């Protein structure tokens, strides 16, 4: 395990880097949660109703 | 006290009625709570901001 550890670690760093790059280019690193989505959509609906 | 209890009770029912009448003519019996006021005003502000 200790022998495989270093190379596995470097590979994990690789896949973290690429997941981060996609998070930068496609979503512009915008934080997202379910509650934020619900609240924003509810207000859009309320403006429409007004 | 027990003697006055009956007449006082009836009078209390009556003034409950008159408080209700003022509630009818001047506020149209519109129910009001602090939370309702706050929520409505917040949405008005959000419409203004939109």
UniProtKB/Swiss-Prot annotation, chains A, B:
It is found in: Mitochondrion intermembrane space. Constitutes the soluble short form (S-MGM1) generated by cleavage by PCP1, which plays a central role in mitochondrial inner membrane fusion and cristae morphology. The transmembrane long form (L-MGM1) and the S-MGM1 form higher-order helical assemblies that coordinate the fusion of mitochondrial inner membranes. Inner membrane-anchored L-MGM1 molecules initiate membrane remodeling by recruiting soluble S-MGM1 to rapidly polymerize into a flexible cylindrical scaffold encaging the mitochondrial inner membrane. This is Dynamin-like GTPase MGM1, small form. The chain holds residues 517 to 566 of 939 of the full protein.
